[PDB]
Design an enzyme around this catalytic site. Structure first.
Site, PDB file in Angstrom:
ATOM      1  N   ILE A  71       0.973  -1.390   0.083  1.00 30.42           N
ATOM      2  CA  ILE A  71      -0.250   0.138   0.073  1.00 30.42           C
ATOM      3  C   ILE A  71       1.037   1.327   0.154  1.00 30.42           C
ATOM      4  O   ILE A  71       1.764   1.157   0.835  1.00 30.42           O
ATOM      5  CB  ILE A  71      -0.610  -0.107   1.419  1.00 30.42           C
ATOM      6  N   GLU A 160      -2.689  -8.955   2.273  1.00 30.51           N
ATOM      7  CA  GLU A 160      -2.437 -10.231   2.958  1.00 30.51           C
ATOM      8  C   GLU A 160      -3.312 -11.235   2.274  1.00 30.51           C
ATOM      9  O   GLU A 160      -2.866 -12.354   2.299  1.00 30.51           O
ATOM     10  CB  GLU A 160      -2.203 -10.247   4.368  1.00 30.51           C
ATOM     11  N   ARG A 163      -2.314 -12.165  -1.184  1.00 29.12           N
ATOM     12  CA  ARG A 163      -1.148 -12.987  -1.027  1.00 29.12           C
ATOM     13  C   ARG A 163      -1.312 -14.503  -0.710  1.00 29.12           C
ATOM     14  O   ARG A 163      -0.717 -15.522  -1.100  1.00 29.12           O
ATOM     15  CB  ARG A 163      -0.258 -12.507  -0.114  1.00 29.12           C
TER      16      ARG A 163
END
Length: 246
Positions: A71, A160, A163
């Site tokens: 970010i 996350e 991912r």
């Protein structure tokens, strides 16, 4: 650009957003059927813009670096905010240029500086879809201490989750009630970099890892990934950080 709206959101739409987010990142290769992220992208094309709307429909636009899915900063109506680190300063050349005001947050955007700033470690911030709604609301009106916690919740519910499929599924579980992350979750977040490396190194070593990765993960404490047939590889990790960036 990808968008998510918390109103009407359910475990399904979130999953759809996370799938879009993943798909928006570019890659050239696939190592072991996992999309390898590019080593470098230049210009504005390096940045992806997420549009997040909270339940009341207010919105922030978040800027994500497509090479590592970090970010960079965000825009709340006419003010951009950016982390205090060189990559975000670089992003500031390419995104939210029409903003009336650019504020630099008193911290970089890594967990360690962010946890210090927020006063809590990650282990003690509930994440969920209700929390993301809250995060978005918090970010709309500047408060740097309160924004460190909102950004710890924002990173985890988007980046996350993109991912790792485990973490995306944790958040679908927390679509109407927040809960602190599991240890597995904290384990996974921390290991993305090493996991990406070992998986990439495993080509030309017969899918075998040069150095074992120990995850606390869901074996209470102390699992050890050795090779690519592990479930963390076949089923969980969803994007690989290019070794040039490690």
């Amino acid at each position: 650009d990808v968008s998510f709206r918390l109103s009407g959101a359910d475990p399904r739409s979130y999953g759809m957003f996370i799938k879009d987010l993943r798909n928006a990142l570019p890659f050239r290769e696939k190592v072991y059927n996992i999309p390898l992220l590019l080593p470098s992208v230049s210009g504005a094309g390096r940045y992806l813009l997420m549009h997040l709307f909270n339940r009341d429909g207010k919105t922030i636009t978040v800027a994500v670096d497509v090479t590592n899915i970090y970010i960079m900063g965000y825009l709340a109506d006419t003010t951009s905010y950016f982390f205090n680190e060189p990559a975000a300063e670089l992003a500031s050349q390419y995104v939210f240029r029409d903003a009336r005001r650019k504020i630099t947050l008193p911290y970089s955007g890594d967990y360690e500086r962010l946890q210090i700033a927020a006063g809590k470690p990650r282990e003690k911030i509930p994440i969920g879809l209700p929390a993301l709604d809250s995060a978005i609301s918090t970010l709309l009106h500047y408060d740097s201490t309160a924004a460190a916690g909102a950004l710890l919740v924002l990173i985890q519910t988007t980046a996350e989750a993109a991912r790792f499929k485990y973490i995306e599924q944790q958040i679908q579980e927390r679509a109407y009630r927040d809960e602190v992350p599991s240890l597995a979750t904290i384990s996974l977040e921390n290991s993305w970099s090493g996991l990406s490396k070992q998986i990439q190194l495993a080509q030309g070593n017969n899918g075998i890892f040069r150095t074992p990765i120990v995850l606390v993960d869901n074996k209470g404490n102390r699992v050890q990934i050795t090779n690519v047939t592990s479930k963390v590889v076949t089923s969980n990790i969803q994007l690989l950080l290019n070794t040039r960036n490690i």
